[PDB]
């Protein structure tokens, strides 16, 4: 009954892309360099399926470690997937 737990989003990168507006990432606002989505945008396959979530701590994309990078860095990973969307993230906490 506590956060810190890790989870993965297995969306289908093929046939449909994502639809989330991501932010943070940069090694400043976040802990070190992990990404944190802003919200789930009601347009892409992400919001639809609802795999990703607000301020989601994405640490991997198809096996690509995100630890040590900015927002745009992950943005590239999440986006630059290809076949399937196998993103292993972490239960993101709230601001306060």
Q: Is the dihedral of CA 40, 45, 50, 55 positive or negative?
A: negative
Determine phi and psi for 10, rounding to 5 degrees.
Answer: -105, 70
Residue 66: closest CA among 14, 11, 18, 9: 9
Contacts (Cβ under 8 Å, ≥6 apart) of 80 = 61
Round to whole Å and give the CA distance between 81 and 87: 9
Which positions ≥6 away from 85 have C-beta within 8 Å? 9, 10, 11, 12, 13, 18, 51, 78
Taken in order of first residue, the domains within the chain and their CATH numbers are 1-96 (2.30.42.10)
Method: NMR
On whether the CB atoms of residues 11 and 78 are closer than 8 A, the answer is no
Q: Quote the CA–CA distance of 94 and 25 in Å, as a whole number.
A: 15
Which residues does residue 60 pair with via DSSP β-bridges, in sequence order? 65
């Amino acid at each position: 009954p506590k956060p810190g737990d890790i989870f993965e989003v297995e969306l289908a990168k093929n046939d449909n892309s994502l639809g989330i507006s991501v932010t943070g990432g940069v090694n400043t606002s976040v802990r070190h360099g992990g990404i944190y989505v802003k919200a789930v945008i009601p347009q892409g396959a992400a919001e639809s399926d609802g795999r990703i979530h607000k301020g989601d701590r994405v640490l991997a994309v198809n096996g690509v470690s995100l630890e040590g990078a900015t927002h745009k860095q992950a943005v590239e990973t999440l986006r630059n997937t290809g076949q399937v969307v196998h993103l292993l993230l972490e239960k993101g906490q709230s601001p306060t």
